Amino acid sequence: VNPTVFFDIAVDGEPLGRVSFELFADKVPKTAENFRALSTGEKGFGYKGSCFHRIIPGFMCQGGDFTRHNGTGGKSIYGEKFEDENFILKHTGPGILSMANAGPNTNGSQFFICTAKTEWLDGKHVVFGKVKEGMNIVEAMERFGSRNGKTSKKITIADCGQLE
């Protein structure tokens, strides 16, 4: 019953592969719904064509800034920002999907995919999904990051949507 969404990832425009995520609507429905809708584009804006602007190997891949492409933009389907829904779920390891933010109750559209356990983020970032399929594609993306997060090739969501 939890929704599944996919990203088709490209590297300098070349198709890399597909990542699919289970969104934990059963535990964080509001946060899951934002990501789901941004992935289908059904509100007239969303993730299709956007980039992963900050990738730090051994840490995470961050994306979702579909307005400014650099970590300074993005918006939710509820308004520019929405609240931290809950912190039930923890950053337990690679594959965890969690909201980026700039303070309490500042969720927009930016998110990160963990490539390591990031327990120090527990209670600060809302975990709302996990990679279901294509963690290998996330690992391939990760290799284009760097210590300071700048990517050496352009990592984009060439297509995205809902499966099932």
UniProtKB/Swiss-Prot annotation:
The segment(s) forming the PPIase cyclophilin-type domain are 6-162
N-acetylvaline modified-residue sites: V1
CDD domains assigned: cyclophilin_ABH_like
Question: What EC designation does it have?
Answer: 5.2.1.8
- Annotated positions of the N6-acetyllysine modification: K27, K43, K75, K81, K124, K130, K132
Cell location: Cytoplasm; Secreted; Nucleus
One of this protein's GO BP terms? positive regulation of NF-kappaB transcription factor activity
The entry annotates sugar attachment on N107
Say where the cross-link Glycyl lysine isopeptide (Lys-Gly) (interchain with G-Cter in SUMO2) occurs. Answer: K27, K81
Q: Name one GO cellular component term.
A: extracellular region
Give the residues annotated as coiled coil: none
Catalysed reactions listed for this entry: [protein]-peptidylproline (omega=180) = [protein]-peptidylproline (omega=0)
For the cross-link Glycyl lysine isopeptide (Lys-Gly) (interchain with G-Cter in ubiquitin), the position is: K27
Query: What family does this chain come from, according to its entry?
Result: Belongs to the cyclophilin-type PPIase family. PPIase A subfamily.
Q: How does it assemble?
A: Interacts with protein phosphatase PPP3CA/calcineurin A. Interacts with PRPF19 isoform 2 (via N-terminus). Interacts with isoform 2 of BSG/CD147. Interacts with FOXO1; the interaction promotes FOXO1 dephosphorylation, nuclear accumulation and transcriptional activity. Interacts with integrin ITGA2B:ITGB3; the interaction is ROS and peptidyl-prolyl cis-trans isomerase (PPIase) activity-dependent and is increased in the presence of thrombin. Interacts with MAP3K5. (Microbial infection) Interacts with HIV-1 capsid protein.
Q: What does this protein do?
A: Catalyzes the cis-trans isomerization of proline imidic peptide bonds in oligopeptides. Exerts a strong chemotactic effect on leukocytes partly through activation of one of its membrane receptors BSG/CD147, initiating a signaling cascade that culminates in MAPK/ERK activation. Activates endothelial cells (ECs) in a pro-inflammatory manner by stimulating activation of NF-kappa-B and ERK, JNK and p38 MAP-kinases and by inducing expression of adhesion molecules including SELE and VCAM1.
Name it.
Answer: Peptidyl-prolyl cis-trans isomerase A
Species the sequence originates in: Homo sapiens (Human)
Gene this protein is translated from: PPIA
